[PDB]
Every structure is written in structure tokens, then in C-alpha cells.
A paper describes a structure:
Nuclear hormone receptors are cytoplasm-based transcription factors that bind a ligand, translate to the nucleus and initiate gene transcription in complex with a co-activator such as TIF2 (transcriptional intermediary factor 2). For structural studies the co-activator is usually mimicked by a peptide of circa 13 residues, which for the largest part forms an α-helix when bound to the receptor. HPLC analysis of the crystals revealed the absence of the receptor and indicated that only the co-activator peptide was present.
A beautiful but unanticipated structure was obtained that forms superhelices with left-handed twist throughout the crystal, stabilized by ligand interactions. Placement of the 13 TIF2 helices into closest proximity revealed their arrangement as a superhelix of outer diameter 42 × 46 Å. The helices are not arranged parallel to each other but are organized in pairs which point their C-termini towards each other and the N-termini are located on the surface of the superhelix. The strong left-handed twist in TIF2 therefore comes as an exception, being the only all α-helical motif that assembles into such a superhelix. The conformation of TIF2 that is present in the superhelix would clash with residues from GR, explaining why the helix of the co-activator peptide must be shorter when bound to the receptor. In addition, non-proteinaceous electron density identified a molecule that is wedged between two adjacent TIF2 helices and that mediates contact between them by means of hydrogen bonds and van der Waals interactions. From the SHELXE density alone it was clear that the ligand is a steroid, which was unanticipated but is easily explained by the buffer component CHAPS, an amide of cholic acid. Cholic acid is a convex molecule that fits into a concave surface patch lined by the methylene groups of Glu1, the side chains of Ala4 and Leu5, and the aromatic face of the Tyr8 side chain.
Residue numbers in the entry:
A (entry chain K), B (entry chain J), C (entry chain M), D (entry chain L), E (entry chain H), F (entry chain I), ...: 1 to 13
Write the structure that this text describes.
């Protein structure tokens, strides 16, 4: 779940 | 480390 | 609705 | 989980 | 220098 | 790990 | 000019 | 035209 | 260092 | 056909 | 500069 | 066979 | 232009 959230947040970067 | 990166990214939120 | 609020809050991040 | 994440983000609010 | 590049890239997240 | 994060972020670049 | 090219390449990142 | 060729070549960068 | 970063980013171009 | 050949030749670049 | 960058990118091509 | 010879000749292109 | 770019790309070939 942490990777999923990170994936969402880093999408743009 | 993931929590640390998340804490940085969520800081403004 | 929880997703809708999360999406707004995570906006800046 | 969604509630747990919301509780964190809403903590300053 | 790595932190500076990371900072730049993470700016929108 | 800094290189690992960078490698991920630079991947579509 | 190097910064200008870098800015272009990194803008997706 | 040079910019158009550059954009094509840089598109995966 | 700018050249080093450019070389990496341009390597598949 | 010229674009097809160009794509082939460029698609290392 | 555009030719120099193009020569670099087309180097493999 | 023509494609095979072409692939070889175009390999450095 | 397409012939000129092709001649350049093929000149090793
Ligand atoms: C979640 C994301 C993409 C995963 C994928 O979909 O393939 C991956 C790519 C690079 C990863 C990061 C890098 O591996 C560097 C760090 C390694 C540590 O073990 C965790 C935090 C750490 C900062 C990682 C967080 C997360 O797992 C990342 C950001
Ligand atoms: C990293 C952050 C703050 C931790 C701290 O400052 O001590 C904590 C507080 C709320 C946490 C999240 C919430 O507990 C809900 C999720 C629980 C899952 O087990 C991991 C992802 C999950 C999405 C967590 C990611 C991260 O651990 C968070 C974001
Ligand atoms: C709401 C947001 C964006 C949805 C979208 O716009 O498509 C999505 C993207 C990543 C999601 C999170 C990630 O999937 C990781 C967690 C997964 C759990 O099932 C719920 C909490 C959890 C922390 C999710 C909460 C929310 O659904 C998120 C934050
Ligand atoms: C998670 C937080 C605190 C829970 C607690 O610790 O008591 C609770 C208090 C108010 C809640 C919100 C409010 O009840 C209003 C909405 C009600 C909907 O059923 C879900 C989203 C909704 C937006 C809720 C999301 C979340 O469950 C909240 C934000
Ligand atoms: C560069 C950035 C901001 C530093 C600041 O200006 O305060 C900092 C804040 C969160 C940091 C990350 C977190 O500390 C978690 C990881 C810790 C490892 O030691 C390196 C990678 C790692 C993924 C870090 C990379 C980088 O230094 C980050 C992204
Ligand atoms: C991590 C990435 C890929 C390395 C690899 O192929 O595994 C490498 C390629 C070029 C590197 C960068 C360049 O060498 C230029 C900078 C050199 C400094 O010493 C660190 C930051 C600096 C910005 C480097 C960060 C990172 O190590 C990079 C981005
Ligand atoms: C060009 C870009 C954005 C500048 C801007 O938009 O204002 C800036 C932001 C982060 C910079 C990088 C970081 O400062 C880390 C490195 C610092 C070294 O002095 C040069 C290479 C180096 C890798 C820098 C190259 C470039 O100037 C970057 C990539
Ligand atoms: C063609 C490309 C994308 C333009 C766009 O559509 O935004 C642009 C973005 C950055 C540009 C480069 C940078 O501006 C730095 C140089 C500026 C000089 O005046 C020309 C060559 C030069 C090396 C440029 C070549 C080309 O115009 C580039 C690569
Ligand atoms: C770093 C890379 C490879 C250098 C090498 O290893 O020989 C070189 C090849 C061609 C170079 C570019 C071309 O010379 C065109 C531009 C010349 C300007 O003075 C700097 C930016 C400029 C856009 C250069 C950036 C960088 O130095 C490049 C991209
Ligand atoms: C064939 C290739 C990729 C087309 C595609 O699938 O997107 C395209 C992308 C950029 C194109 C070039 C650019 O548009 C610049 C030139 C435009 C002229 O009208 C034809 C020659 C010209 C030099 C083009 C040749 C060819 O059509 C190119 C090289
Ligand atoms: C830079 C490179 C080599 C020049 C040299 O050998 O030193 C030259 C050879 C063929 C050139 C291309 C061909 O002349 C066809 C195009 C002509 C247009 O006027 C500019 C873009 C255009 C797509 C040119 C871009 C660049 O000047 C090229 C790619
Ligand atoms: C043989 C080579 C690669 C095929 C492959 O993917 O393995 C292919 C890629 C581009 C092809 C060429 C392009 O499709 C353009 C021309 C199309 C005509 O139908 C045949 C000659 C023609 C000049 C082709 C000859 C040959 O089949 C090429 C050169
Ligand atoms: C430009 C180059 C050299 C022309 C010359 O200066 O002699 C010529 C030699 C063979 C030509 C190719 C061959 O005639 C086969 C193809 C014929 C199609 O009508 C155009 C694309 C086609 C793939 C041609 C593209 C280009 O005009 C080529 C590659």
C-alpha cells in the first residue's frame, strides 16, 4: 500500500 | 524510508 | 467520497 | 486505511 | 547535489 | 537509495 | 543552454 | 524543422 | 556534472 | 516509405 | 548548436 | 533474404 | 530534406 501511494504521488515527477 | 519519503511528500497536505 | 476528499487533499503533493 | 490516511492529513486542520 | 536534483524533481509532488 | 529514487524519477526522461 | 535543455528533458519528471 | 526533428529524437528522454 | 546528467538522459536518444 | 525508413534508422536515437 | 546536438543524437544512426 | 541483407547493412545506421 | 537526412544516416552503410 505504501508503494501504491508513492506511485500516485510521484506520478507527475 | 518509505514513511520518510511519504512524510516529505505529504508535508504541504 | 473518501477518495474524492483524498484526491483534493493530495492535490499539491 | 482511507480513514487512517485522512486522519493524518486532517491533523493540522 | 543528489538532494538538490531530487528537490527539483519532487517539487510538484 | 538516492540513485535508486533518481533512476525511477528520470525513467521517462 | 545546458540548463535550458535539462529543463526540457526533466519537465516530464 | 530542426526543432521538429529534435523533439522527435528527445521524445523518449 | 551537467554533461554527465545530459549523457544519462540522452543515452536512449 | 521514406518516413518508414527514417523511423527504422532513427529508432535507436 | 542544433547541428552539434543532432550529430550527437544521430551518432548511432 | 533482401530484408536480412538490409538489416545487416543498416546495422550501423 | 528527407533525401538529405537519409544520405547522412546511410553514409556509413
Ligand atoms: C514505488 C516506486 C515504483 C514501484 C513500481 O511501481 O514499480 C518505487 C520506485 C523507486 C522506489 C524507491 C527506491 O527504491 C529507493 C528507496 C528504497 C527503500 O527500500 C524504500 C524507499 C525508497 C525511496 C523506495 C520507495 C518506492 O519503493 C519506490 C519510489
Ligand atoms: C508516513 C505517515 C506519517 C508517519 C509519521 O510521521 O510518524 C504515515 C501516517 C498515516 C500513514 C498511512 C495510513 O496508516 C494508511 C495506510 C496503512 C498501510 O499499512 C500503509 C500505507 C498507508 C497509506 C500509510 C502510509 C504512511 O505510513 C502514513 C502516511
Ligand atoms: C484517491 C487517490 C486517487 C484516485 C484517482 O484519482 O484515481 C487514490 C490513488 C492512490 C490511493 C491509495 C493507494 O491505493 C494505497 C491505499 C490502498 C487502500 O486500499 C486504501 C487506502 C490507500 C492509501 C489508497 C487511498 C486512495 O484510494 C488513493 C490515495
Ligand atoms: C477519518 C475522520 C476521523 C475519524 C475518527 O478518528 O473518528 C473521519 C471524521 C469525519 C469523516 C468524513 C465525514 O463523515 C463526511 C463523509 C462521510 C462519508 O461516509 C465518507 C467520506 C466523509 C468525507 C468522511 C471521511 C472520514 O471518515 C472522516 C473525515
Ligand atoms: C531531498 C529531500 C528534501 C531535503 C530537504 O530539503 O529538507 C529529501 C526529504 C525526504 C528524503 C528521502 C527520505 O529521507 C528517505 C530516503 C533516505 C535515504 O537515505 C536516501 C533516499 C531517500 C528516499 C531520501 C532522499 C532525499 O534526501 C529526500 C527526498
Ligand atoms: C542515478 C543516475 C543513473 C545511474 C545508473 O545508471 O545506475 C545517475 C546518472 C547521472 C547521475 C548524476 C550525474 O552524474 C551528475 C551529478 C553528479 C553528482 O556527483 C551527484 C548528482 C548528479 C546529478 C548525479 C545523480 C545520479 O547519480 C545520476 C542521475
Ligand atoms: C536546470 C534545472 C532547473 C533550473 C530552473 O528551472 O530554474 C536545475 C534544477 C536542479 C539542478 C541540478 C542540481 O543542482 C544538482 C547538480 C548541481 C551542479 O552544480 C550542476 C549539475 C546539477 C545536476 C544541476 C543541473 C541543473 O541546473 C538543475 C537540473
Ligand atoms: C526542440 C526542443 C523542444 C522545443 C519545444 O517544443 O518546446 C527545444 C527544448 C530545449 C532546446 C535547446 C535549448 O533551448 C538550448 C539551446 C538554445 C539555442 O538557441 C539553440 C540550441 C539549443 C540546444 C536548443 C535546441 C532546441 O530548440 C531545444 C532542444
Ligand atoms: C553531454 C553531451 C556529450 C558530451 C560528450 O560526452 O562528449 C554533449 C554532446 C553535444 C552537446 C550539446 C551541443 O554541443 C549543443 C549545445 C552547446 C552549448 O554550449 C551547451 C548546450 C548544448 C545543448 C550541449 C550540451 C552537452 O554538452 C552535449 C549534449
Ligand atoms: C519520420 C519521423 C517520425 C515520424 C513519426 O512516426 O512520428 C519524422 C519525425 C520528424 C520528421 C522531420 C521533421 O518534421 C522536419 C522535416 C520536415 C519536412 O517537411 C520533411 C523532412 C523533415 C526532416 C521530417 C522528416 C521525417 O518526417 C521526420 C524525421
Ligand atoms: C547536423 C547534420 C550533420 C551536419 C554535419 O555533417 O556536420 C545535418 C545532416 C543532414 C541535416 C538535415 C537535412 O539537411 C534535412 C533538414 C534540412 C533543414 O533545413 C533542417 C533540418 C534537417 C533535418 C537537417 C538537420 C541537420 O542539419 C542535419 C541532420
Ligand atoms: C529490413 C528493415 C527491418 C525489418 C525488420 O524490422 O526486421 C526494414 C525496416 C524499414 C524497411 C523499408 C521501409 O519499409 C521503406 C520501403 C518499403 C518498401 O515496401 C520496401 C523497401 C523499403 C525501403 C523497406 C525495406 C526494408 O524492409 C526495411 C529497411
Ligand atoms: C536518398 C537516397 C540517395 C539518393 C541519391 O543521392 O542518390 C536514395 C537511394 C535509394 C532511395 C530509396 C529507394 O529508392 C526505395 C524507396 C523508393 C520510394 O519511392 C521512396 C523511398 C525509398 C526508400 C527511397 C528513399 C531515398 O530516396 C533513397 C534511400
Amino acid at each position: 500500500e505504501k508503494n501504491a501511494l508513492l506511485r500516485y504521488l510521484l506520478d507527475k515527477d
